[PDB]
Amino acid sequence: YEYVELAKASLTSAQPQHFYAVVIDATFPYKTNQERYICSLKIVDPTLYLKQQKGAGDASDYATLVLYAKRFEDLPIIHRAGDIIRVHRATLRLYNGQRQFNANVFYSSSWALFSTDKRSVTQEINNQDTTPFSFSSKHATIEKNEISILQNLRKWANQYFSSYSVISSDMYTALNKAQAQKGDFDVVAKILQVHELDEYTNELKLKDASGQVFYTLSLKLKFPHVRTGEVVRIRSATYDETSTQKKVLILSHYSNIITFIQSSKLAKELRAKIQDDHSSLNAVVLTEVDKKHAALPSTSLQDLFHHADSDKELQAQDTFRTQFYVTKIEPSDVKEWVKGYDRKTKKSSSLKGASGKGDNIFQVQFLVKDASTQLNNNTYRVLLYTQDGLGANFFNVKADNLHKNADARKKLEDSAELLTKFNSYVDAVVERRNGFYLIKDTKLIY
Amino acid sequence: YEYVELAKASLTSAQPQHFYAVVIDATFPYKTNQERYICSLKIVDPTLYLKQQKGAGDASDYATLVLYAKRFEDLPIIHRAGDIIRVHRATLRLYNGQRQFNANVFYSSSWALFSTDKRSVTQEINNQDTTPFSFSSKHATIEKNEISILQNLRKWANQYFSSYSVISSDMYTALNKAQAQKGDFDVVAKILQVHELDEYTNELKLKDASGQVFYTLSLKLKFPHVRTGEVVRIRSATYDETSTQKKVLILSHYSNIITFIQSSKLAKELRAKIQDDHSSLNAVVLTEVDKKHAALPSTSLQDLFHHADSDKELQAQDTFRTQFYVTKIEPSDVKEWVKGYDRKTKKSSSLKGASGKGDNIFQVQFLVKDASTQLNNNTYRVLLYTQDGLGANFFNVKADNLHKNADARKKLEDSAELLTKFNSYVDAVVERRNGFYLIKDTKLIY
DNA sequence: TTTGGGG
DNA sequence: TTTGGGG
């Protein structure tokens, strides 16, 4: 078996071609006629892909794929944009100005789906994987020459989705423009809530960039992968005219609810911008980030400490945002949280000597964790070192000699408790400085 | 390394012992004192386990385990009751009348968590696994002699949870009795809704057997595994006295939200009994099961067709309940849905001959799928064969010659469309009969 | 695999 | 591993 890249496939329906590609869109498998099923997809690869960060996408920068079968069960069900598909025996032809690969599974063509995500669903562990999780033939195995192809496409897919939006603005309609649509349309939104209306009827509360909120019923039997907080792209939805209270989206037998691979820049972006207008301390965010960082995407501790100098994005920037819960604060002695600092030697020192140099700072360490790291036994440190102003206002308390000022000390002691004993978490912006992440432009709201 | 079963471990804190066990309860890791962290667990194994189906549990039928460490990161975070833990160098002593295993991770003891679930979270694929997903040492590998131990304990765990409730009534308080509790208490309920109140603040709408509804905020960073429709056991929750509109549960730094392994009988049971009182066709249930089957647990197509004659429960019973969506209905010709039947020869025949024997029946086949099977390419058939009454009323239409009665035919033709083109699903009770599942006591409500 | 392909 | 263990 020899594979060719999408942009290099020969233009013919005479010689069977094979390839590995990244899926960016897919309908659910559906009956188009009697004894004739179809699954339509949009695919990209290193030789053919979308490069815009925003706005319309160039239709000549991605290719399509139409899979044909005579039974529903022979077609693939694709949940995640960013996953990989391997097709054996496909033809290529031009349709509506695009490279359109075709493949009759009912003849001798086959397909196989490979997971592109490195970590698990909860983002908690590493799942690194040379075998398809879903495939058309009984031939559930891969060849040697394929290994490198799959491994490289995965790496590329992740790098690609983390660098580009991939899904362009013409591939969806803002919800505020939905009621006005003639027929069906696509949606890119964040799932704000999942409500079980019946054992397998999950009502999804959707919200997109336009700030409009819609609801839709998703069949749990088909889409057991959707969960609260995730961003999805709905392929084909129509507006329910008979919706009076809630604005409702209706899905069809060919509609698909597509998630994005974890590295997706578009998803990270949307998870950050979209919030739900809603309405004894437990599991609440304890901080407030300067508004100037409002639309800044969050980075997991996993990416922050293990891929920092390993990405064509992270190694470039110095300011990040992340969320975590504090497992411990050091120094243990809160009185030592505020120290004396010498500008000339950049040396800190206890204030238990009663010095009065005035220049006091904070030098606190937070041992933290988040979902991407809590299952491992590493320690991750985030610093609150203010000799240069970064994080100066975190505690909403001036850096005074805590050996003398008893109130400031107790105030800080409460904060320590607050940061570690109520399932609460920190949302902070940090700046890399000499191999350390220092908190900045972030302050407690408690 | 030699391992001993829980009930056979020597009663001493002198010789270090090692074991593999099934976790049925665990607190989140927490700081109990300065430089001293703890994780408390309840464990069982083939030699020591709970056998009641309902009511109080015998405290001498399970053992406890207390893990000690000097830092948070050295203790395990356990999400799923039913998962397996391997402990190296543990001591055993009697405490409050129970076998209590102890282990100092800060000394030389270690732990390792092994997934007991055969299929993935979505229940969509097979994840069968000889390596821990979480562990205390850098020694992330298992030995040869261990392989059999782990494989056997897994098999046992699943068989155990599918046969017993495991979690007894004394291990939780019904929500209708919660407000009256003195201090903290435990909860076993179904998650009816997950609502994102903040990037990492997920509000859970809980409902238990007592029919009372409570809400609680779960920190997504700690519990990224909870999802709508699943049953959980909350270890340590207190009632929020300051809750006026919603009845709220408050969790602490040591509280844990525990799910159950898929085979859990208790979970299957609760997912079936608990519904939420809520308030253009899409993703709705199309049928109604006779009320006499109201508290009957559902069985996935996966279990129905691949483990049917492979379980110490399924091979015993003949009547099941399951949910699925129809991908195709056969015969293709709806007119052939109703045939003539000869009682003596048990032979069916087309009615296109205009025979008037009166005895007409339905002999329809539904090619179906559900989350446990949609990703595979097998076909699963459920029958609606009424020669013996089973399923006689499914269609709410008498079995008439569809070659003559044009209205009955069209009525059935609409049903075919309804069963296959609106993301809707069937909830039906079936009886195994000669290697086939025939629908019974189920009828369309559309 | 000249089907249907945004159904 | 005589800690603390339902915290």
Task: State the virtual CA torsion across A134, A138, A144, A146 in degrees, nearest 10.
Answer: -40
In whole angstroms, how large is the CA radius of gyration of chain A?
Answer: 26
Terminal CA-CA length for chain B: 63
Distances (CA, A) of B9 to A206, B13, B63, B114, B155: 54, 11, 11, 21, 22
DSSP one-letter code for B35: T
Distances (CA, A) of B226 to A194, B32, B215, B246, B256: 12, 26, 14, 21, 11
CA-closest candidate to residue B182, choices B115, B254, B253, B239: B239
Residues 155-214 of chain A with CB under 7 A from strand C are: 171, 183-186
- Residues 6+ positions from A181 with CB-CB distance below 8 Å: A173, A238, A239
DSSP one-letter code for B30: E
Q: Report the run of H or E that residue B419 belongs to, with start and end.
A: helix B406-420
On strand C, nucleotides with any atom < 7 Å from a protein CB are 1-7
Q: Is A172-282's fold the same as A283-446's? A: yes
CA-closest candidate to residue B53, choices B162, B148, B210: B162
Residues B93 and B99: their CA atoms lie apart, in Å, by 6
**∠ CA B208-B210-B211, rounded to 5°:** 70
Is A211 within 8 Å of A195 (Cβ atoms)? no
- Residues 6+ positions from B247 with CB-CB distance below 8 Å: B175, B178, B179, B212, B213, B214, B215, B239, B240
Tokens of A3: 């594979």
CA-closest candidate to residue B76, choices B49, B37, B46: B37
CA atoms within 13 A on the CB side of A145: 6
DSSP one-letter code for B425: B
- Pairing, β A63-69 against β A98-104: parallel
Residues A42 and A19: their CA atoms lie apart, in Å, by 14
Which runs of E-coded beta strand occur in B331-441? 338-342, 347-349, 360-369, 380-385, 426-432, 437-440
- The partner residue sitting opposite B200, judged by closest CB among A124, A242, A323, is A323
Tokens of A219: 């069949």
Q: Which long-range contacts (CB under 8 A, 24 or more apart) does B183-187 make?
A: B183/B238, B184/B236, B184/B237, B184/B238, B184/B252, B185/B236, B185/B237, B185/B238, B186/B233, B186/B234, B186/B235, B186/B236, B186/B237, B187/B214, B187/B233, B187/B234, B187/B237, B187/B249
Decide: helix, strand or coil at residue B76.
Answer: coil
Is B267 within 8 Å of B260 (Cβ atoms)? yes
Distances (CA, A) of A223 to A233, A234, A259, A390: 13, 11, 10, 45
From the CB of residue B250, how many other CB atoms can be counted at a distance below 10 Å?
22
Tokens of B21: 């066990």
- Pairing, β A134-135 against β A380-385: unpaired
CA-closest candidate to residue A252, choices B301, B417, B286, B278: B417
Distances (CA, A) of B332 to B329, B379, B413: 7, 16, 11
CA atoms within 13 A on the CB side of B444: 16
From the CB of residue B155, how many other CB atoms can be counted at a distance below 10 Å?
12
Q: Report the run of H or E that residue B412 belongs to, with start and end.
A: helix B406-420
Q: How was this structure determined?
A: X-ray
Residues A156 and B31: their CA atoms lie apart, in Å, by 43
Contact B251 A324 (CB under 8 A): no
Q: Nearest nucleotide to A68 by CA–C1' distance?
A: C3
Is A99 within 8 Å of A48 (Cβ atoms)? yes
CATH fold of B283-446, please? OB fold (Dihydrolipoamide Acetyltransferase, E2P) (2.40.50)
Residue A57: which region, alpha, beta or left (left: phi > 0; alpha: psi -120 to 50)?
A: beta
Residues A267 and A428: their CA atoms lie apart, in Å, by 19
Compute CA B386 distance to the chain's CA centroid, rounded to the nearest angstrom.
31
Burial of B446 (0-12, 13-18, 19+ CB in 10 A): middle
Minimal CA separation from A355 to chain B, in Å: 30
- Residues 6+ positions from A361 with CB-CB distance below 8 Å: A338, A339, A341, A348, A385, A386, A387, A399
Residues B3 and B237: their CA atoms lie apart, in Å, by 35
Q: What is the CATH number of domain B172-282?
A: 2.40.50.140
Q: Report the run of H or E that residue B176 belongs to, with start and end.
A: helix B175-178
DSSP one-letter code for B392: T
- Pairing, β B248-260 against β B213-219: parallel
| Domain B2-171 -> CATH class | mainly beta
Q: Which residue type is seen at B84?
A: I
Compute CA A352 distance to the chain's CA centroid, rounded to the nearest angstrom.
47
Q: Report the run of H or E that residue B66 belongs to, with start and end.
A: strand B63-69
Residues B392 and A430: their CA atoms lie apart, in Å, by 67
- Pairing, β B134-135 against β B110-114: antiparallel
Residues A261 and A81: their CA atoms lie apart, in Å, by 6
Q: What is the chain B residue with the closest CA to A219?
A: B283
SS (H, E, C) B266-328: HHHHHHHHCCCCCCCCCCCECEEECHHHCCCCCCCHHHHHHCHHHCCCCCCCCEEEEEEEEEE
Contact A250 B276 (CB under 8 A): no
Q: Which long-range contacts (CB under 8 A, 24 or more apart) does A235-243 make?
A: A235/A25, A235/A26, A235/A27, A235/A186, A236/A27, A236/A184, A236/A185, A236/A186, A237/A184, A237/A185, A237/A186, A237/A187, A238/A181, A238/A183, A238/A184, A238/A185, A239/A178, A239/A179, A239/A181, A240/B280, A242/B280, A243/B280
- The partner residue sitting opposite B422, judged by closest CB among A199, A224, A253, is A253
Which residues of chain B neighbour A421 with C-beta distances below 8 Å? 252-253
CA-closest candidate to residue A171, choices A340, A45, A26, A48: A26
Tokens of A231: 């961003």
Q: Is the peptide bond before A16 cis (omega within 30 degrees of 0)?
A: no
Distances (CA, A) of A122 to A113, A256, A372, A373, B225: 21, 22, 8, 11, 6
Q: What is the chain B residue with the closest CA to A136?
A: B377
Compute CA A379 distance to the chain's CA centroid, rounded to the nearest angstrom.
24
Residues A3 and A47: their CA atoms lie apart, in Å, by 13
From the CB of residue A306, how many other CB atoms can be counted at a distance below 10 Å?
15
Residue B248, beta-bridge partner list: B215
CA-closest candidate to residue B226, choices A287, A277, A228: A228
* Domain boundaries, given as residue ranges, for chain A: 2-171, 172-282, 283-446
- The partner residue sitting opposite A201, judged by closest CB among B135, B285, B370, is B285
Is A256 within 8 Å of A26 (Cβ atoms)? yes
From the CB of residue A305, how many other CB atoms can be counted at a distance below 10 Å?
16
SS (H, E, C) chain A: CCCCCHHHCCCCCCCCEEEEEEEEEECCCEEEECCEEEEEEEEEECCECCCCCCCCCCHHHCEEEEEEECCHHHCCCCCEECCEEEEEEEEEEEECCEEEEEEECCCCCEEEEECCCCECCCCCCECCCCCCCEECCCCCCCCHHHHHHHHHHHHHHHHHHHHCCCCCHHHCCCHHHHCCCCCCEEEEEEEEEEEEEECCEEEEEEECCCCCEEEEEEECCCCCCCCCCCEEEEEEEEECCCCCCCCEEEEEEEEEEEEECCCCHHHHHHHHHCCCCCCCCCCCECEEECHHHCCCCCCCHHHHHHCHHHCCCCCCCCEEEEEEEEEEEECCCHHHHEEEEECCCCEEECCCCCCCCCCEEEEEEEEEECCCCCCCCCCEEEEEECCCCCCCCCCCCCCCCCCCCHHHHHHHHHHHHHHHCCCCEEEEEEEECCCCEEEECEEECC
Residue A389: which region, alpha, beta or left (left: phi > 0; alpha: psi -120 to 50)?
A: left
Report helix angle B265-273 to B144-163, nearest 10: 30
Is A27 within 8 Å of A66 (Cβ atoms)? no
Is A124 within 8 Å of A262 (Cβ atoms)? no
Terminal CA-CA length for chain A: 63
Residues A328 and A330: their CA atoms lie apart, in Å, by 7
Burial of B144 (0-12, 13-18, 19+ CB in 10 A): exposed
Residue B5, beta-bridge partner list: none
Residues A104 and B199: their CA atoms lie apart, in Å, by 44
Residue B411: which region, alpha, beta or left (left: phi > 0; alpha: psi -120 to 50)?
A: alpha
- CA A66, A71, A72, A78 dihedral sign is negative
Is B103 within 8 Å of B90 (Cβ atoms)? yes
Minimal CA separation from A442 to chain B, in Å: 16
Residues A149 and A157: their CA atoms lie apart, in Å, by 12
Q: Nearest nucleotide to B108 by CA–C1' distance?
A: D1
Residues A423 and A283: their CA atoms lie apart, in Å, by 5
Which residues of chain A neighbour B217 with C-beta distances below 8 Å? 282-284, 423
CA-closest candidate to residue B324, choices B363, B356, B366: B366
Tokens of A24: 């960016």
Phi, then psi, of A330 in degrees rounded to 5: -130, 145
- Residues 6+ positions from A152 with CB-CB distance below 8 Å: none
Residues 52-71 of chain A with CB under 7 A from strand C are: 64, 66, 68
Q: Which of A227, A419, A429 to mutate to test the interface with B (most CBs of B within 10 A)?
A: A227
- Residues 6+ positions from B338 with CB-CB distance below 8 Å: B351, B360, B361, B362, B363, B399, B400, B401, B402
Residues B441 and B290: their CA atoms lie apart, in Å, by 5
Token pair 């020869």 is found at B345
CA-closest candidate to residue B222, choices A268, A429, A425, A195: A425
Compute CA B139 distance to the chain's CA centroid, rounded to the nearest angstrom.
32
Token pair 């010709």 is found at B333
Tokens of A123: 């983002």
Q: Give the resolution in Å.
A: 2.7
Enumerate residues near strand D (beta carbon within 7 A): B 13-17, 25, 27, 30, 32-33, 36, 38, 40, 42, 64, 66, 68, 89-91, 93, 95, 100, 102-104, 107-109, 171, 183-186, 235-236, 254
Residues A437 and A303: their CA atoms lie apart, in Å, by 13
- Residues 6+ positions from B385 with CB-CB distance below 8 Å: B361, B362, B363, B364, B391, B436, B438
**∠ CA B234-B237-B242, rounded to 5°:** 140
Is A222 within 8 Å of A208 (Cβ atoms)? no
Distances (CA, A) of B146 to B7, B135, B150, B431: 19, 16, 6, 41
- Pairing, β A80-81 against β A63-69: unpaired
Q: Report the run of H or E that residue B237 belongs to, with start and end.
A: strand B231-239
CA-closest candidate to residue B99, choices B134, B128, B64: B64
CA-closest candidate to residue B257, choices B22, B27, B43, B21: B27
CA-closest candidate to residue A374, choices B283, B408, B222: B222
Tokens of A26: 């897919």
Q: Which residue type is seen at B427?
A: D
Decide: helix, strand or coil at residue B330.
Answer: strand
Residues B363 and B401: their CA atoms lie apart, in Å, by 13
CA-closest candidate to residue B228, choices B161, B275, B285, B291: B275
Is A206 within 8 Å of A258 (Cβ atoms)? no
